[PDB]
């Protein structure tokens, strides 16, 4: 039985940055969410629509896996119909979203002594962000009436800032590994099914 490669998702060596979230395609395999639910190794497990108890006997067409690591207090900004800096400039979810969001504490992996200048996030955007949109542009954001000319200065700010992860931070200011699964059904025959 070709089990879906969930292990390489949850237990990957490194995860993606907030602004540049990696998308993985899941198809032509069989999954088992009962073990995922009963593991109880995730701090946060909430979602709407489909139920974890009845998720086993459900057939879909494509499953999307997304990876990004944010702070503890931001996990509530990955809910449908939510507004925040993440939901406006980094990662927006549609109102009619279906799927589930998984979050667990990860202090022991991404926190280093003296600071961790490896993870970043989008600071400013010219406008709002379309749902399921990704932006990699590093152009200097402009919040005034003068052209930036590609050089940092007055009213010309870098759109990206680095986190300051450190093992001495607070409970809600600690790294959190978050993966969200998207389930879609199309007019094509279903391929992803349960055991």
């Amino acid at each position, epitope marked *: 039985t070709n089990l879906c490669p969930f292990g390489e998702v949850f237990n990957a060596t490194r995860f993606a940055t907030v602004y540049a979230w990696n998308r993985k395609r899941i198809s032509n395999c069989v999954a088992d969410y009962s073990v995922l639910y009963n593991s109880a190794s995730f701090s946060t497990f909430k979602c709407y629509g489909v139920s974890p108890t009845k998720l086993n006997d459900l057939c879909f067409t494509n499953v999307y896996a997304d990876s990004f690591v944010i702070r503890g207090d931001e996990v509530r900004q990955i809910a449908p119909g939510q507004t925040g800096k993440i939901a406006d400039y980094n990662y927006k979810l549609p109102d009619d979203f279906t799927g589930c969001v998984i979050a667990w504490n990860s202090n022991n992996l991404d926190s280093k002594v003296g600071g961790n200048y490896n993870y970043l996030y989008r*600071l400013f955007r010219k406008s709002n962000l379309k749902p399921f949109e990704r932006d990699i542009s590093t152009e200097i954001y402009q919040a005034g009436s003068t052209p930036c000319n590609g050089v940092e200065g007055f009213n010309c700010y870098f759109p990206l800032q680095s986190y300051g992860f450190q093992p001495t931070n*607070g*409970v809600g200011y600690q790294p959190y590994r978050v993966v969200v699964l998207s389930f879609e059904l199309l007019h094509a025959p279903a391929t992803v099914c349960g055991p």
Partner: antibody
Amino acid sequence: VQLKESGPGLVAPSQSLSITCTVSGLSLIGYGVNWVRQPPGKGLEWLGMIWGDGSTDYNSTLKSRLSISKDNSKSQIFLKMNSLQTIDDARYYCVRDDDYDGQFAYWGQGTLVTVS
Amino acid sequence: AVVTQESALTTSPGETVTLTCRSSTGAVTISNYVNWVQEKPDHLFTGLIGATNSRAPGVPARFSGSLIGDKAALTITGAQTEDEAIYFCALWYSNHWVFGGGTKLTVL
């Protein structure tokens, strides 16, 4: 968003203190609440902290006396003190945080507590 | 931990002023998570900047903060007649938030 708290005002020394902070048109859920006090004629003074998940982080020199609890359903934050000192008079605020990586954003009007 | 701020600065409308927040425990880093709050008469408080640069969408664009050297600073561009206040910087040191002494700002 508005924040309101009720304080006894005048309490005898070496007596318990209980301050409740209420929220209007909002929900506690995963939002932290900080307690900050300011004695008259001086600057601000940190007291404690409660996180969204229920964990707490108190002032080092006041952990023996302080105690913070909150109720999600009734939407209130509680502050408890014991063995009050004459110096322990100030204006007490309950401070909330917004969803733009900025803490100490929403404040209250401030309740005044005097001990004598 | 001990943090210090300037006592007071004089400002006229039109130009820019930088208000710093210095920590005596060492050089301020990104991990300090400096926040800024505002004082208004009748004891009115308002938060402006979190994470040292995360401006709120409702806060006017004239308020901006960053790190310069070993001290975190707040920059106001084009001060108005409504910008008189007292500003406090909050730092995350050890396991308890640390407030500053306050900086009174006067507009001419």
